[PDB]
C-alpha cells in the first residue's frame, strides 16, 4: 500500500542576474550550497541514510555536466554511498525532481530523499558539433544559455522553432492577452516581490552564497523601481505589432534550491519537521508554438485525478515565464488575472528564472506561503519549452 510523503526543510540560494552576483560560481558548486545548508540545518538526520538526491537541470553541457546531482552531493560533503540522478524537463526540471522523489517514496522504494534543482545560465557554455568530414569548412559555435541550438530541420518544418518570446507572442495573439494587461501583471509582480523582500519573506528561504570573501544574500533580479509608465515605453522583443517585452518577461538567471522529502517513518527516525504532504504531480503536452499554455492540461489532469477544483487551492504559484502566458493560463482555468491567491509574493518576472532551479523554488515558496497564511492546499505549475506543462499539489500538515 502507498506511503504518505512529506516535504520537510527547504532552502534556496538567492537568484542572480545574468553576469551578476553569482556569475563566478560554478553550477556544481552552486548546486552544493543548498545541500550543505540542509546538512547544517537538520542535525538529527543520519546522512548516510539518504536514499537519493534528485536534481533538475536544463543544460548539462557546462560545469553541470555528467550528472550534476551526484557531483553536487559529493561537493556538499554527503557520503559517497549516496546516489544521485539529474532530471531534464527544461524550466520544469526542478519541479520534476520533487515529483519524482515523491513517486519513489510513495511506491515504497525509498524513505528519505533530497530534491532540488540548479541552473547557471551565466556560465552556460558554447557548443560545437564534430566535423562530419576531413577538413570540413562547416564548423559552428552555438550559445546554450537559452533556447534552440542544433536545430533539426524536421522539427522546424513540422512544429516550427519559435523562440520562447515568439511563443509568448503567439499565446498573446491566440488567447487575446493585451499588452496593457501584460504590463499590469508585470507591475504587480514587481510590487509584490518588493513587498515580500522588504518584509523578510525571501530571507527566510535563502541561504547565502560565499564567494572566496564576498557574501551573496539577496535576490538581485528585482526591479522595485518599475512603473507602468516605464513598462509602456519598452519596445516588444519581436517588433511593434507584437506585445512581449523584456519588462513583461522573466529573465535569464543563476540559482539553486533543495528540500528534504521523507516517509512518516523517516520523519520520526531523523527528527524532521513534516511541513506538507505531497498530493501528486501531472504533466501535459501542447503545441510547441504556444508552449506557455502548457500548464492548462497539466493542472486539469492533476486536479481531475485528485478530485480538487482549482478554486480549492489557498495558494497558486504559477511560473511567470511571460505575463502573456501567465494571464492566458489563469483565464483558461477561470482564475482572475489579479486573484489574491496567485503569486502573492511575486514571481519570475521580478525574481528571475534559472531553468533547473525555478520549479523547486515554486514548490518550496508555495509551502512557505501556506505556512504564513495558514492555508491548506497549494498548487505549483509551470510551462516548458517545446510545449509542455507540469503541475504539483501539496497540502500543509
Amino acid at each position: 500500500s502507498m506511503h504518505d510523503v512529506f516535504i520537510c526543510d527547504a532552502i534556496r540560494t538567492p537568484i542572480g542576474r545574468f553576469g551578476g552576483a553569482l556569475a563566478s560560481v560554478r553550477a556544481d558548486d552552486l548546486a552544493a550550497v543548498p545541500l550543505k545548508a540542509l546538512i547544517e540545518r537538520n542535525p538529527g538526520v543520519q546522512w548516510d541514510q539518504v536514499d537519493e538526491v534528485f536534481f533538475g537541470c536544463a543544460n548539462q553541457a557546462g560545469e553541470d555536466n555528467r550528472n550534476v546531482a551526484r557531483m553536487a552531493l559529493l561537493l556538499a560533503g554527503l557520503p559517497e554511498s549516496i546516489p544521485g540522478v539529474t532530471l531534464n524537463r527544461l524550466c520544469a526540471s526542478g519541479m520534476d525532481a520533487v515529483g519524482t522523489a515523491f513517486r519513489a517514496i510513495a511506491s515504497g522504494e525509498m524513505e528519505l530523499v533530497i530534491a532540488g534543482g540548479v541552473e547557471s545560465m551565466s556560465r552556460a557554455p558554447f557548443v560545437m558539433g564534430k566535423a562530419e568530414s576531413a577538413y570540413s569548412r562547416n564548423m559552428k559555435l552555438e550559445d546554450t544559455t537559452i533556447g534552440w541550438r542544433f536545430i533539426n530541420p524536421l522539427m522546424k518544418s513540422q512544429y516550427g522553432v519559435d523562440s520562447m518570446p515568439e511563443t509568448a507572442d503567439n499565446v498573446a495573439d491566440d488567447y487575446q492577452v493585451s499588452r496593457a494587461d501584460q504590463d499590469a501583471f508585470a507591475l504587480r509582480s514587481q510590487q509584490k516581490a518588493a513587498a515580500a523582500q522588504a518584509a523578510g519573506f525571501f530571507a527566510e528561504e535563502i541561504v547565502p552564497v560565499r564567494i572566496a570573501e564576498i557574501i551573496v544574500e539577496r535576490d538581485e533580479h528585482l526591479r522595485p523601481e518599475t512603473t507602468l509608465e516605464a513598462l509602456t515605453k519598452l519596445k516588444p522583443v519581436n517588433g511593434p505589432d507584437k506585445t512581449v517585452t523584456a519588462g513583461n518577461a522573466s529573465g535569464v538567471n543563476d540559482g539553486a534550491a533543495a528540500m528534504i522529502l521523507a516517509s512518516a517513518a523517516a520523519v520520526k527516525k531523523h527528527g524532521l519537521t513534516p511541513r506538507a504532504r505531497v498530493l501528486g504531480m501531472a504533466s501535459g503536452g501542447v503545441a510547441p508554438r504556444v508552449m506557455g499554455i502548457g500548464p492548462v492540461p497539466a493542472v486539469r489532469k492533476l486536479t481531475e485525478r485528485l478530485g480538487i477544483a482549482v478554486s480549492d487551492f489557498d495558494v497558486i504559484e504559477l511560473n511567470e515565464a511571460f505575463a502573456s502566458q501567465g494571464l492566458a493560463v489563469l483565464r483558461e482555468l477561470g482564475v482572475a488575472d489579479d486573484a489574491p491567491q496567485v503569486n502573492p509574493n511575486g514571481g519570475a518576472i521580478a525574481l528571475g528564472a534559472p531553468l533547473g532551479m525555478s520549479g523547486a523554488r515554486l514548490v518550496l515558496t508555495a509551502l512557505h506561503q501556506l505556512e504564513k497564511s495558514g492555508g491548506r492546499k497549494g498548487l505549483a505549475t509551470m510551462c516548458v519549452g517545446v510545449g509542455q506543462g507540469l503541475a504539483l499539489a501539496i497540502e500543509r500538515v
Copy 2:
C-alpha cells in the same frame, strides 16, 4: 493500493561503432527510431493516451539537447499532447528511465508510458566555457564524447578525476582481478554474442535504421574472430603495469532503445501483450575511483528489500563496462565468473555501450532471454561514472 506494472513491447536500434554505421544519425532522430517502431508494432494502442515518455541520455549538449525525450516523441510522429522528460545517471540513464516509469505507474499517477534511452557518442559535441572577463586569453575546447570535462579542483582533490579505464584498473588492483581472468571473460562475451547474433537473437530485438539508402540492421561492434591469443597481445590503456585493454573494455558507441510499460487496465484497453512485471529498482553509491563496483550495493539493497537471493535469478544482465569490474562484482555477490545465467548472449565488450541506451537494452534483453529460456526472475544491473550502481528486477508473467 500500489498498482502492478508490466513491461510490454520493447525494441532497439543496432549499436554502431564510434564514427561507424550510425555516426551520421542525429541523437534526436536516432531516439525517434524505436519510438516509431513501437507505433508500427502495437496497432491497438490509442497513442494520445500515452502519459509520458521517459528517456535516458548522459550527454545532452549535442543534438540531444533540451529534453531529447520530448524532441524524439515529436519527431517519431507521436501526438504533441504527450509529455516527455530526460534522465541522466550516466551509463545507467536508460535503466533509470525504466524504473522511473515503473514508479510513476505503481504510485497510481500514470497508466501507459514509454521508457528508453539514447546516446550518439560519435556526434557528442565540443564545449567551450564562456569568457569570465573581457578579452580573456583563457578559452578552451573540451571533448564531451566520454569522461571528465570542466573538472572541479575540489572534486579532483577529494575524490580524484580518474578516467573510466583508470577506475577499472583500480578495481582490478584493489579486488585482485587478473589480466588473464579479464581476457577470459572478454573472450566469452565475444563468443556468446557471436552465437546469439548467428541464432537471430539480436535480430528479434532490432529495428533497422534507414540512412539516406543504406539499411543498418546488425550490431557493428562485435569482434567474433577474437581469440585469447589476440587479447593477450593487446597493450593496456594506462601503461605496461596495468591490466585494462581495449579488448577487455566496452567501447564508445551509438544507439537507442524503447519499451512500453502499462498498468493492467492499460494493457487491456490498448491490446498490449504483458511480458513481465517490474519488481523494483535500487541505486547505490561507491567511491568514484572504483566506480565499477557500484552494482554491488545496488543489487544488495534491491534484493534485501524484495527478499530475493541473487541466486534466485534465472538471468543476470550485468553491464560489461570493463571485464575487471564485471568480475569483481560477480565475486562480491558470490556468483561464478562464468555462471551460465550471467550475460548468456554476451554483453557490452562485444556489443558496445551507448551510455544512455545501455540500461534500457539490459532490461529488454533480460526479458527477451527469460522468454527464450522459460526463466522467471531477471536482474539487470550496471555501474555509473563517479561511483554509483543501479539494479532492476523483473518477473516474466
Copy 3:
C-alpha cells in the same frame, strides 16, 4: 651609386593539390620548406650561410603558417639559423610580391643572394574566433579562413561592399560584357593547354615531388592534381553558376582552392659568379595598381599599364604573358582592356589556374617561374606575369631571359 642587375637562377615548386586532396596532410610550414630543401640539393655551389634573406608570400598566416612562415620554413629546410626571413601578404599576389621585393633589395645594393617564394595550404586554413568583448559574452562565433571575408568591418561593407571573389567575377562579367560562352571557351583552352603541357613533361621540369606516408608504405605526389583534361565545352555548358541562374561564373570557369609552395633564387652578378649559380633571366621591374574591390579582377590592368609605361615596353612586346586565371571572366576582361586577343598564342601557353589550381601565396611565385621556363623552352625574350588581388588590386612583374 648605380642599381645592380638582378638575376633569377634556379626555381622549383611542389605539385598543386586539391582542397582536402594529395597534399592536405602537409603542414603549411613543412610544405614551404619542401622547395627550399630542393633548392639546397639542386645548387651545391652555394655557400648557404651567405643567403641574405628568404622572402615568402602567404595570404593566411593564421594556421601552421603563423608567426612569419618564411623564417619557420628556412629553419625546417635546414638552412643556417643565421639566415633571416620575412613574410609578405598581398593575398593572391603574395608570391609575386616576394619576388619583386627580393628584386628591389638586390637592385638597391642592400643584398646579394636571396630566396623568394610563396606557400598556401588552403586545406589546412584554420577557423578563427574573436575574443569576448565582455565578461560572459553570448556573442562568440567561429569563422572559416580558407578563402574570402572574415571579421567583416561594417564600414568596409557600407562603402565598398564585401562581395565574395566569385561575386566580383560576375560583376566583371556584367560590367565588361564577358559572356558565359567566352568564359567557358577560355576555361576549355586552359584545360587543353595544361593537359598538353603535362603530357609533354613541362610541369615535371618545374616540380619537386612530395613524399607522403600511407599505412602500408610511402607514395610520391608528383603531378598537379587539379587538372580536368577530359573537360569539354559541353561539360562546361551544363554547369550551374555559383551565384544563381542569371550569373555566369561557375566552378568550371574559375580557379579552385588548393595547396602548394614554390621558391627561386635571386642574385647579383657577383653572387651568381661566387656561388656557381646559372643565371636564367634578369628582373626588369614590378608595379602594383588598385581598383574598386567590387571588380577586383580588373586589377592587373593599371598594374600592367604602370609597369610597361615606366619600362617603355609595349604589352605586345612580351613573348609570354602569364595572366593569373582567378576567373575566366576577369582574365578575358583584362586581355580585352590591354588590347590582347582572348586566345593570343603568347598568353598562358601551358594553361593556368583554372586547370592548375591557385594556392594563394604560391601562385604569384609560380607565375614568375613558369613564365621564365616558357621563355627558355620557346626561345622567347621578355616575359610578363600579372595577377589580380582580393579587395581590388593588381600586380605585374617583367623579366628578360639571359
Copy 4:
C-alpha cells in the same frame, strides 16, 4: 642601369599605445591602422593623394580584424582612393621597421616615388584559432590564443630549435650573457624615469594623434600612452617574482608588455618631396637583417647592426641616437654590451622605450624609426640607429640621417 634615388622620411605620426584590454581594446586593428593614415591626410594638404604608390604596413598576427592584407583594408578605411595599392609585411616585432625599409628600397630602386610605411597591432583583439579536423568525427579539436607566442607547434621545430616562450628566451639571454637581475631592474627603472620625463615634457604628445572611442553618453578621446608606470622604484622591481619560476630573472617589470597601437609615416624621393610640398626630415641610409638561435632571439640585433654598419661604414659610436627595442631588459643590456655601448649610454633610448611604453608587435618598429628621427630633431643630432629583436631568432636595424 641608372642611378639609385635618395629617400626621405617626411611627416610621421602614431596613436597612443594602449594596455592589453585597456584604452584601445575596443578598436578593431584595421580601424586602428586607419587612424594614423587619416592624420597624415589631415596634416599634409599639399599632397596629391592619388599619387601615393603604395601603403606598406607591418602586422605580426593577421588572423583577426587585421586579416587579408590590413595595409589595403586600412588605406580604404582611411579614405584614400581605391587606386592606391597596399601590402602587409610580417617579421613579428620588427614588421613595422621592415615596412619602412621595404618602402625605402622601392623608392631607391626607382620603382616608386611617394609611399606610406607604418605598422599596427591589436594584441587585445588577437583571436583564437582552431585547426580543421583531419578526419570525420575527430576528437582532437583545440583552440589556441594568438595574442603572442607559439601556436600550431611543429614537432620538428621543437626538437631542433625548441619552442621557448619570449620571456624564456630572455631568461636564456640573461643566463648565457650573464645579465644580472639587478642590472635588468636598473635598466627598467631608467626606462620608466626617462619615459615619465618625456611624457611630462610633451615629447610623446608631438608624435601622437588621439583615438576616438565609442561611449554610451558621447565619444571620448584617448590622448596619452597608457602603459607607463612613472612611480616605479628599484624597490618595487626588486620584489616582483620572475615570470618563469623562482630561480629566474625576467619579470613583468623588466619586460615589455602586450599592447595596442598603430603608426605611419611618408617616404618620398626628392622629386616627390618637391611636387607634394613635403618637408624632408631625414634620409634613409639603409636596413639590414640578421638571424640568431631562436632560444636567444633577444641577441638578434647584434648581427643586424654589425651587418648594417659594416656596409655603410659607420661605427656604432657615430650614432647620435640609438633606439634599441626593449623587448626585455636582459636582451637590451646584452646587445649593448656586445656592441660596446655602456648600459646607460646617454644616446640610448633617451626618452625610454618599450618597458615603459609597451610594444604592439606590428607598430613597434615604425615607432622606433619615427621616434629616433624626432629625437634627432630635438637634440640637433645627425645620424640615428633603430634596431630590434624578432621572435624565432632575428634582428633588424635601420639607419637614418637628419636633413
